[PDB]
Design an enzyme around this catalytic site. Structure first.
Site, mmCIF file in Angstrom:
data_model
loop_
_atom_site.group_PDB
_atom_site.id
_atom_site.type_symbol
_atom_site.label_atom_id
_atom_site.label_comp_id
_atom_site.label_asym_id
_atom_site.label_seq_id
_atom_site.Cartn_x
_atom_site.Cartn_y
_atom_site.Cartn_z
ATOM 1 N N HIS A 147 -10.784 -4.487 -2.702
ATOM 2 C CA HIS A 147 -9.417 -4.772 -2.290
ATOM 3 C C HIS A 147 -9.398 -5.257 -0.849
ATOM 4 O O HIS A 147 -10.167 -4.786 -0.006
ATOM 5 C CB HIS A 147 -8.484 -3.558 -2.460
ATOM 6 N N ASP A 174 0.833 -1.195 0.000
ATOM 7 C CA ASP A 174 0.000 0.000 0.000
ATOM 8 C C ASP A 174 0.871 1.249 0.000
ATOM 9 O O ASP A 174 1.878 1.329 0.709
ATOM 10 C CB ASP A 174 -0.919 0.008 1.222
#
Ligand code: KBJ
Lengths: 115, 112
Positions: B98, B29
């Site tokens: 996600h 991320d």
């Protein structure tokens, strides 16, 4: 006994009461006894898996079924503004019951980071 | 509607890719909330978990199996937390489904 003897195995076999939202042959959805949001429930498989880190490749459909049931129950409970799904693994994850379970939390704004 | 995650899948912008197969992509991320914080996303554009169809079940479970395998590979032997956000209350940031995976520190309760 099928499902094991964690609290969640006892709930699966109706040996300890719970507030059940949905049940099928694969899983059970029921409200959390210590809710962290106005709506907070759990979706668990009836097959005993201790934690996500030991789930088998062949458990994919079952784990996905937890999320599909989770999102359907959320809709049925009127969580139209959204919700958060959480799986905790082990100590750092905050796992305290070693039977795989999906948290679903909604009815308020959830914050970031997620713990 | 395309999203930045679609661009990442199409390799049009960079991301630190952890794992890829024919149906999903795992990558770190860009705004990590833990010492290890990555995403597992399907290549199929499902906008949000609330619109996933029944036939998506094994794909969604695949995201979780890939996520737990990546977590082990990244050395998260003390545990981790998997998160799927839906909608504004869930804090969903990109309208492409996600799975967050966070570890390397104690995750706290409540989860936001
Ligand atoms: N309906 C119902 N729910 C229950 C019961 N016993 C536990 N639970 C819930 O299971 C969940 C297990 O979650 C985690 O393992 N980690 C979360 C952190 C966390 C750690 C420790 C405590 C509460 C919360 C918790 O939310 C509990 O409240 C029960 O008898 N009935």
């Amino acid at each position: 006994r099928p499902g094991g003897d964690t609290i969640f195995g006892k709930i699966i076999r109706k040996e300890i009461p719970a507030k059940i939202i949905f049940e099928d042959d694969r899983c059970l959805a029921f409200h959390d006894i210590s809710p962290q949001a106005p709506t907070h429930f759990l979706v668990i498989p009836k097959k005993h898996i201790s934690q996500i880190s030991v789930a088998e490749d062949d458990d994919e459909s079952l784990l996905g079924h937890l999320m599909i049931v989770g999102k359907k129950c959320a809709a049925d409970l009127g969580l139209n503004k959204g919700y958060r799904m959480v799986v905790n693994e082990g100590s750092d994850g905050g796992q305290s019951v070693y039977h795989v379970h999906l948290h679903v939390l909604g009815g308020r704004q959830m914050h970031w980071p997620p713990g």
